[PDB]
Design a binder for this molecule. Sequence first.
Ligand SMILES: N/C(C(=O)O)=C(\C=C\C=O)C(=O)O
Ligand SMILES: [Fe+2]
Length: 174
Amino acid sequence: MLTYGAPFNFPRWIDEHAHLLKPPVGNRQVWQDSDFIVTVVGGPNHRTDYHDDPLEEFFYQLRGNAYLNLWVDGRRERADLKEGDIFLLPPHVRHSPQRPEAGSACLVIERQRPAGMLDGFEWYCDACGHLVHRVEVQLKSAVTDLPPLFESFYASEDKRRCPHCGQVHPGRAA
Ligand SMILES: N/C(C(=O)O)=C(\C=C\C=O)C(=O)O
Ligand SMILES: [Fe+2]
């Protein structure tokens, strides 16, 4: 049977969920309990964390524009996601998505992680670029598994202290 229901109009679905594609929620998973994690991410949202995903991520920027701060080959880089752009991110490429536009919408597709395949979330020093803090997580549920992790980093000057230059990371926003 059609466990995930029948086909449905995507632009209409996005419009109808527009109130959830803005702060404080910012995103919405389309189907529940599926192998493919299909999410629409709106805006505005900025962030300071870099994700280390052990699997690929697919992006299709449907509405508005966004960009990904990356680390590529030891250097800091930016991949722009202009409206209409698609992108496939390889495993383990550190990325920090920035979505400054209200009313933007990006289709993001990931896969469920098998037991033992962990995700990393990392912060880097604005002053010297050294890794400041990394947490590895078995990522089941995104909604419960991630906010406390981010909160506890922002709450602690110890966690936020660069081990190489002692500069304390701004936490939630530079
Ligand atoms: N599903 C999350 C994830 O990759 O952990 C991604 C969604 C990025 C949206 O811009 C992200 O934060 O990189
Ligand atoms: Fe530093």
